Design a protein around this nucleic acid. Structure first.
Ligand code: ADP
Ligand code: ADP
Ligand code: ADP
Ligand code: ADP
Ligand code: ADP
Ligand code: ALF
Ligand code: ALF
Ligand code: ALF
Ligand code: ALF
Ligand code: ALF
Ligand code: MG
Ligand code: MG
Ligand code: MG
Ligand code: MG
Ligand code: MG
Length: 1603
DNA sequence: TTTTTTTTTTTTT
DNA sequence: AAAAAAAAAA
């Protein structure tokens, strides 16, 4: 075995043998721009230095001779061939092997070894592994010839990805398995880092692994540096290896060899070995001896005979000049074209993009990809080159292209139908040799044939990528031999499941990465402002791959909208930087002559002096370029016209034509129904045949605006379709907006794929002109609905969208059909820069949309008292049609639409077309109104004059103006509808006007004034509703009232008590049918929601309510610990639930109400600091949103008997929003309905009020509201009569064998549920025993009375708070004592670290059996509880001071604890008391969570001292019941805490006895049954102490009297 | 043998 | 201001 140096010393050591083996086969593979070519050339250089003959096979068609020479290759003697077929390439090798003249042969990319049949054939249908079988044959033939010739052969290979291999690594190597086996050495090279120079990237840090070794031990690895333009930093390696072997001394930063100091820092040491080649050889030799795991151990005149013989053979076989010496091959020299950016041309090193090569540009949407491309076309045409554009993205605007300076009339252009078509076109135009530069707009948009022909959902695993990989092989060869440049524009996609690196990729697999000679990364970095205006995009491009010069240089510049790249701008800056232009502050001078004042003018001057500009540019290029470059055309047009004939008789009548004459390319627009928006769009409206996205917050105007454009389009007679995936569109309101309901096609689809497939049908039909999809948010994938809630479908939704886009773009343009997607806003979490807002359904839509709108409600349109509309602002966020970032404001008047004439007045006054004399409005001298109100109304009345003003405004303000047959349309229309319905169900799509299931039905809320405030008269069936508010506000109560109401009409209800707090007895008191109310206390949140989904689908339940979304704890959270952070897991769960439920709730006509709690958002100073648990999903999907608040107390002299209540309608999809209702909740009774009725009746003048007297129709019915209410109670007949008239008078949107089948599907659902979520997860409330309320004595009798129930509730949460030393701990211990006396097990959590055992015992606690913990962290404390709860062994747990619950890291912690504990505490019947401190200006530590979840809340206070003449022996104490979910709240108890004894029981007994008249109090004397028992409370207490018998007797009577 | 494709979401005085 | 865990396609 003999070896050759690789040019890397460390690699030679890693090889064991000291180099690569002669007469053997070697493979090198790795990622793109890793070093494969470079390394190869270094070994050639090395071999030539010893005088060996080399050959290079540049199948990749990418080798740069000049760079090869820079690496130290003898160009003039390096044999080189760019073969046409793969067989040719290999046959050449076999000849050169057999010749025995060549010593080393390298083949650049087996990847590029395209079989003959593959080029000869098409692009599209393949021949899988007619390339692997070819390789396998080549190997067999070559092995023998290579050994007997002692000739080394190196194959360079690229990396591809084996799909979904979850066992080893997903990487392979092109050309099958043949090469793996035959190779004696296999190398894996990778770029691991950058070799930096402060600012500059001057090289690639490199690592090679020996992956196969037949010559020595395998799996050794070598690292080194590739210095761009120099090669492998050999001396660098040598320094390091030398120091490592102790041959070179390193004294800190000083390097010594044999006592002589040779450098300071690796930099100089390297340079020294460079200067002493003699000493360098000496060190290298010793290193090789020290580290090589094996030693190696008249004539050439015959070689040249057989050499020349082989070359003659080859050329008379494969063409005139198939193989020649690299140094003389002219077609190998690199030529460049300007990019239209000067700084980019400098960054490229070569001065521009390389001819006959492949280039990729990628970046975010609206970054400059298309624009930049067109600038290079413009540039190339200016020098007279022929260009072609492939608008696969179907989005190129001819007018804008011309504004950028492109010759439209001569720019060849094609909008292809399939991806294969697009690429086949290229291959024709390449081979033609007529075209010089071709650009393909979006490889993203290169949809494979099978994908368009298939459905949406049809999965084509890496079909797209495999197509690209084939295209590359075929094109490389044809592009070089034609000297034709090809630029691919690409989009960015996110790769999911990557935590290192960057999460960005590029569509169309890995093929393009490798074949591209240049790869550009363009990004918009800032806005080019004009005080107010945004006139351009600040832009930065990174050279990410470079086969032509050094990579990783970057260029910045400006794209001025409507003009292009600011070239002269660059030139000024570059000139000043190089000292060619003088800058004296704000003055710019060139060669003494002053040329401008400020960059603005200097630029304009260079514009005016093109001659001087060229002169400066040239000098800059000379000063700053890293690699300076350097009868006939009548034949071109022959082969051109020949290619075009070929193409059109292959891909259709007019598949390719000159851009300037293609009519279907011009842009047409439709009014949005907002004038100012039309101006902001520049073009005057939305573009036909394109895609548009509108997004914004909930109830912002997305649906409404959409309908207005439909209305507008129908007014001109266009056919529209609406896809109500959100399942929320109200036909009546749509009509009020002016939509033709009867002719508006409409579909509520079941799956997302269905929705999109429908579009694709309606697009292709060419019958529909405008289609709108309501909420991409609501486009739920098939698998998601078919799966459960919790089933994770990682970016399945987004991948679906991305496929939809590809298919739709083509069909929408060729049909001239507009498509608008409405989208919702979600928050992205873990972003601190930028804005935290996104858009559902991934990145696909961002790119494909031609217009992107951001709509927001900015204010209320008021009417003194009334809110009659939403002040609205829309921002143009993306614009492919005109300049972006203009914004429009206007009014949406509820029930009317966009105030168009409003806009018109304002715009008219602003342009001085309408005169405004204070409050008076004049047009052409004629006064038309007084105040905007009337002026608007006047333009309404004079539509003729209105058109006249509008037209002038449009002329004045539009930056981009535009100005037998239908019987065939209805054929293809009806054809599409038949298709659809026989595919997606009986009535999946129909005319809105006849769809009955679309009409709106309502249910009473149990509050009359709320029903009026709703406009519709109640809550909407088959929709989602949210009620939120502060704690004890009325949320649960109100809910139950609607259930009661619905049951009274015989509807089936279900309740989901996730809050675990519903009291059956109170529910019954409110008038609910307990025995028939289905009820579930679920364990996880997913369980709760899955239950709903079952009950929805069942169609048996009519109304479902979920108590606290706050309490919908995700599975993982319960299964995890307290402290385990689940970032927005809860919210993501909700968002999934919404998608699944909307569809099932409408088709079942089932109402769903979510009760929600209020949390505070922290770090907000504007607005209100209040939110709602469970993210943003529910905001959007809810058709009604209610805000309920307790505003006052309903008093009874002394007693508090109810809560004065106010509800605000905060969202309304059913009627006008923002009306509010007030009423009374009477504790234990419910909403005072008749109360409302009296007030409403008096207000409408139906009931007469003469001071305190109430009369109806002359008959006096009461004295004061009290009696009047009671009278209507007694006359239900007359009450109905008054209510009906009130409803007629005040409802703004007036309303709209069989049940035996229901119980079949009901029972079926319940069986399903219980065999899924446990033995008794759902049952009738009336029979659920675990739901009944049990109590424990507090140790204070008066407190037990004040509680109403007689004590604290088991299996619930309780909070006690108060000032310091008020009695919190003490009282707690008394209840423990009490509970232990009945034999319950207690636990105490002394987080306050202050509990005194001896005092606890004095209070009567069983110390020996009281479980007790002093925890270290707060999470620990709560986790302990959760364990003790779940154990079901402990009955009562108390936590001393939530104040003292210090988080580990040291409210969000509390909020998580609540969710987890509620469920575990009820199912264990375990009481939990939290003691809290005080921080009216009073609060409670640990946020708002506990307020809501507590069933009882106590306020204890020391009010006085219990004196003993001199001594203070106790604290006089008062407790207020502040919250009560168990009985009526706000009762208060007083008593005595005697220090060292406890709650002075006998004290209480004396007071209670005197109060009930059982004990006589004659001043200071206390008598019982005539017998005097004490003098002053002191002695009376002591007497009852002494007569325990009589004490029991009194207590018993008090209990009978007061319980 | 031949090949990738894609995000999803708040949480709290 | 400091937190992360998810996969199914010829
Ligand atoms: N002509 C050149 N001038 C300067 N640097 C180059 C040139 N060609 C390649 N390089 C650099 O050398 C490194 C490896 O290039 P190369 O060996 O072509 O990668 P591969 O062959 O693995 O695709 C890359 O960082 C690349 O930018
Ligand atoms: N027809 C037009 N008129 C004015 N500005 C435009 C037009 N088309 C695009 N632009 C602007 O040029 C910039 C880049 O657009 P483009 O080159 O189409 O990006 P990409 O192809 O990368 O999505 C954006 O700021 C965009 O708003
Ligand atoms: N049926 C209706 N009656 C009265 N006003 C409505 C109705 N539907 C919607 N609105 C009002 O129109 C505005 C926007 O509603 P919409 O277009 O549905 O918003 P989005 O679809 O963006 O959530 C809101 O202010 C809302 O109150
Ligand atoms: N079982 C009951 N007996 C008497 N009053 C009750 C009962 N349950 C609740 N209340 C009272 O009804 C009002 C609202 O209670 P609820 O609807 O549970 O509030 P929320 O669910 O909004 O926290 C409060 O004043 C509360 O004290
Ligand atoms: N170990 C003890 N011995 C005597 N008196 C005590 C003891 N602990 C508390 N007290 C008294 O009882 C009253 C209330 O105590 P405690 O219930 O601990 O108050 P809080 O828990 O509200 O701070 C105070 O006046 C206090 O001085
Ligand atoms: F790629 Al674009 F607007 F042309 F996102
Ligand atoms: F030489 Al390459 F991708 F194979 F840059
Ligand atoms: F998307 Al909406 F109200 F229609 F939030
Ligand atoms: F003494 Al304390 F809460 F203030 F127990
Ligand atoms: F029912 Al609550 F706070 F949500 F009392
Ligand atoms: Mg290479
Ligand atoms: Mg583009
Ligand atoms: Mg909507
Ligand atoms: Mg509640
Ligand atoms: Mg205490």
């Amino acid at each position: 075995v003999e070896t050759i140096s690789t040019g890397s010393l460390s690699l030679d050591i890693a090889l064991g043998a000291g180099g690569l083996p002669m007469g053997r086969i070697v493979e090198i593979y790795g990622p793109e721009s890793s070093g494969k070519t470079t390394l190869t050339l270094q070994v050639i250089a090395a071999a030539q230095r010893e005088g060996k003959t080399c050959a290079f096979i540049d199948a990749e068609h990418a080798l740069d001779p000049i760079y090869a020479r820079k690496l130290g290759v003898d160009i003039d003697n390096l044999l080189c061939s760019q073969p046409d077929t793969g067989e040719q390439a290999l046959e050449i090798c076999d000849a050169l092997a057999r010749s025995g003249a060549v010593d080393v042969i390298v083949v650049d990319s087996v990847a590029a070894l395209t079989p003959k049949a593959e080029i000869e054939g098409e692009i599209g249908d393949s021949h899988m592994g007619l390339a692997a079988r070819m390789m396998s044959q080549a190997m067999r033939k070559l092995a023998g010839n290579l050994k007997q010739s002692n000739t080394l052969l190196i194959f360079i290979n690229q990396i591809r990805m084996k799909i979904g291999v979850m066992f080893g690594n997903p990487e392979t190597t092109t050309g099958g398995n043949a090469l793996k086996f035959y190779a004696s050495v296999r190398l894996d090279i990778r770029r691991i880092g950058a070799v930096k120079e402060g600012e500059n990237v001057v090289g690639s840090e490199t690592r090679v692994k020996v992956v196969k070794n037949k010559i020595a031990a395998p799996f050794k690895q070598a690292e080194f540096q590739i210095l761009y333009g120099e090669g492998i930093n050999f001396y660098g390696e040598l320094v390091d290896l030398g120091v490592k072997e102790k041959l070179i001394e390193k004294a800190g930063a000083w390097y010594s060899y044999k006592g002589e100091k040779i450098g300071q820092g690796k930099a100089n040491a390297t340079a020294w070995l460079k200067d002493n080649p003699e000493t360098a050889k000496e060190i290298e030799k010793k290193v090789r001896e020290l580290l090589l795991s094996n030693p190696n151990s008249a004539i050439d005149e015959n070689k040249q005979k057989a050499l020349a013989a082989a070359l003659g053979q080859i050329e008379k076989q494969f063409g005139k000049g198939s193989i020649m010496r690299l140094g003389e091959d002219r077609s190998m020299d690199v030529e460049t074209i300007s990019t239209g950016s000067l700084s980019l041309d400098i960054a490229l090193g070569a001065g521009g993009l390389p001819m006959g090569r492949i280039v990729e540009i990628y970046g975010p949407e609206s970054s400059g990809k298309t624009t930049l491309t067109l600038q290079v076309i413009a540039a190339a045409q200016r020098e007279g080159k022929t260009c072609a554009f492939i608008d696969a993205e179907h989005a190129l605007d001819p007018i804008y292209a011309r504004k950028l300076g492109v010759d439209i009339d001569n720019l060849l252009c094609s909008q292809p139908d399939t991806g294969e078509q697009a690429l086949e076109i290229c291959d024709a135009l390449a081979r033609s040799g007529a075209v010089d530069v071709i650009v393909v707009d979006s490889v993203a948009a290169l949809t494979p044939k099978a994908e368009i022909e298939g459905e949406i959902g049809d999965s084509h695993m890496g079909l797209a990528a495999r197509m690209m990989s084939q295209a590359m092989r075929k094109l490389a060869g044809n592009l070089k031999q034609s000297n034709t440049l090809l630029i691919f524009i690409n989009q960015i996609r996110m790769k999911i499941g990557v935590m290192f690196g960057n999460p960005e990729t590029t569509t169309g697999g890995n093929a393009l990465k490798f074949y591209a000679s240049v790869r550009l990364d363009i990004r918009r970095i800032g806005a080019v402002k004009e005080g107010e205006n945004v006139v351009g995009s600040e832009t930065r491009v990174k050279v990410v791959k470079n086969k032509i010069a050094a990579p990783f240089k970057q260029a910045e510049f400006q794209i001025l909208y409507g003009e292009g790249i600011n070239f002269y701008g660059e030139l000024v800056d570059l000139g000043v930087k190089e000292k060619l232009i003088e800058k004296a502050g704000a003055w710019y001078s060139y060669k003494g002559e002053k040329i401008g004042q400020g960059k603005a003018n200097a630029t304009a001057w260079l514009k005016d002096n093109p001659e001087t500009a060229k002169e400066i540019e040239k000098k800059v290029r000379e000063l700053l370029l890293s690699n300076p470059n350097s009868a006939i055309d009548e034949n071109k047009q022959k082969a051109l016209a020949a290619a075009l004939g070929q193409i059109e008789k292959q891909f259709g009548k007019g598949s390719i034509m000159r851009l300037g004459e293609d009519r279907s390319m011009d842009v047409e627009t439709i009014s949005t129904g907002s004038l100012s928006l039309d101006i902001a769009l520049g073009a005057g409206g939305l573009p036909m045949g394109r895609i548009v996205e509108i997004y914004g917050p909930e109830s912002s105007g997305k649906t409404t605006l959409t309908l207005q454009v439909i209305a507008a389009a129908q007014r001109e007679g266009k056919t529209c379709a609406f896809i109500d995936a959100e399942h929320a569109l109200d036909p009546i309101y749509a009509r009020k907006l002016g939509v033709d309901i009867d002719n508006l096609l409409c579909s509520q689809p079941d799956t997302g794929e269905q929705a999109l497939e429908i579009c694709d049908a309606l697009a292709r039909s060419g019958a529909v002109d405008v289609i709108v999809v309501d909420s991409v948010a609501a486009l739920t994938p098939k698998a998601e609905i078919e799966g459960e809630i919790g089933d994770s479908h990682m970016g399945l939704a987004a991948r679906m969208m991305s496929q939809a886009m590809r298919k739709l773009a083509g069909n929408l343009k060729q049909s001239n059909t507009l498509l608008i997607f409405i989208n919702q806003i979600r928050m992205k979490i873990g972003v601190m820069f930028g804005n935290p807002e996104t858009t559902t359904g991934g990145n696909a839509l961002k790119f494909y949309a031609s217009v992107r709108l951001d709509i927001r409600r900015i204010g209320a349109v008021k009417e003194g008292e009334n809110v009659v509309g939403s002040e609205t602002r829309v921002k143009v966020v993306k614009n492919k049609i005109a300049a972006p970032f203009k914004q429009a404001e206007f009014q949406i008047l509820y029930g009317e639409g966009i105030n168009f004439y409003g806009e018109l007045v304002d715009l008219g006054v602003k342009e001085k077309l309408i005169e405004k004399a204070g409050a008076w409005y004049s047009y052409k001298g004629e006064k038309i109104g007084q105040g905007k109100a009337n002026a608007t109304a006047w333009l309404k009345d004079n539509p003729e004059t209105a058109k006249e003003i509008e037209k002038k405004v449009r002329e004045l303000l539009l930056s981009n103006p535009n100005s037998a047959i239908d019987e065939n349309k209805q054929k293809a229309l009806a054809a599409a509808l038949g298709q659809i319905e026989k595919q997606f169900g009986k009535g999946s799509i129909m005319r809105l006007g006849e769809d009955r299931s679309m009409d709106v039905e309502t249910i009473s809320t149990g509050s009359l004034s709320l029903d009026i405030a709703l406009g519709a008269g109640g809550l909407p069936m088959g929709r989602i509703v949210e009620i939120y508010g502060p704690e004890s506000s009325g949320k649960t109560t109100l809910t139950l009232q609607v259930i009661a109401a619905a049951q009274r009409e015989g509807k089936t209800c279900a309740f989901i008590d996730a809050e675990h707090a519903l009291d059956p007895i109170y529910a019954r008191k409110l008038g609910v049918d307990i025995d028939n109310l289905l009820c579930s206390q679920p364990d996880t949140g997913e369980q709760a929601l899955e239950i709903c989904d079952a009950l929805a689908r069942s169609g048996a339940v009519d109304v479902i309510v979920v108590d606290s979304v706050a309490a919908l704890t995700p599975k993982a959270e319960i299964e995890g610990e307290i402290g385990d952070s689940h970032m927005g897991l809860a919210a993501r769960m909700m968002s999934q639930a919404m998608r699944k439920l909307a569809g099932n709730l409408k088709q079942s006509n089932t109402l769903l109400i979510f009760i929600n709690q209020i949390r505070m958002k922290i770090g907000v100073m504007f607005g209100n600091p209040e939110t709602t648990t469970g993210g943003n999903a529910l905001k959007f999907y809810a058709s009604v949103r209610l805000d309920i608040r307790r505003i006052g107390a309903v008093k009874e002299g002394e007693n508090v008997v109810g809560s004065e209540t106010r509800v605000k309608v905060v969202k309304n999809k059913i009627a006008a929003p923002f009306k509010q209702a007030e009423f009374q909740i009477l504790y234990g009774e419910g909403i005072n309905f008749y109360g409302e009725l009296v007030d409403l009746g008096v207000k409408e003048k139906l009931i007469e009020k003469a001071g305190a007297w109430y009369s109806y129709k002359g008959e006096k019915i009461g004295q004061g509201k009290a009696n009047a209410t009671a009278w209507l109670k007694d006359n239900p007949e007359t009450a109905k009569e008054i209510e009906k008239k009130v409803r007629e008078l005040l409802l703004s949107n007036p309303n709209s064998a069989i049940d035996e089948n229901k119980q079949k599907a009901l029972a079926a659902a319940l069986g399903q549920i219980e065999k899924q979520f446990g033995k008794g997860s759902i049952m009738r409330l009336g029979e659920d025993r675990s739901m009944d309320v049990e109590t424990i004595s507090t140790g204070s009798l008066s407190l037990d009375i004040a509680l109403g129930a007689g004590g604290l509730p088991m299996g619930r949460i309780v909070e006690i708070y108060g000032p310091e030393s008020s009695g919190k701990t003490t009282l707690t211990l008394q209840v423990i004592a009490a509970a232990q006396r009945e034999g319950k097990t207690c636990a105490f959590i002394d987080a306050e670290h202050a509990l005194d055992p001896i005092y606890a015992r004095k209070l009567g606690v069983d110390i020996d059996n009281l479980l007790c913990s002093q925890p270290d962290t707060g999470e620990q404390a709560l986790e302990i509880c959760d364990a003790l709860a779940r154990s079901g062994a402990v009955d009562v747990i108390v936590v001393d001071s939530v104040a003292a619950l210090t988080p580990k890291a040291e409210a969000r912690m509390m909020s998580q604890a609540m969710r987890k504990l509620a469920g575990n505490l009820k199912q264990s019947n375990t009481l939990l008391i939290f003691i809290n401190q005080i921080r009216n200006p009073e609060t409670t530590t640990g946020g708002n969570a506990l307020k809501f979840y507590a069933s009882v809340r106590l306020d204890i206070r020391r009010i006085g001292a219990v004196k003993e003449g001199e001594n203070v022996v106790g604290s006089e104490t008062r407790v207020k019941v502040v919250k009560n979910k168990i009985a009526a709240p706000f009762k208060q108890a007083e008593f005595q805490i005697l220090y060292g004894e406890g709650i002075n029981f006998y004290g209480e007994l004396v007071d209670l006895g005197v109060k009930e008249k059982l004990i006589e109090k004659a001043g200071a004397w206390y008598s019982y049954k005539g017998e005097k028992i004490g003098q002053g409370k002191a002695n009376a207490t002591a007497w009852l102490k002494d007569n325990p018998e009589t004490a029991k007797e009194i207590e018993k009577k008090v209990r009978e009297l007061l319980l």
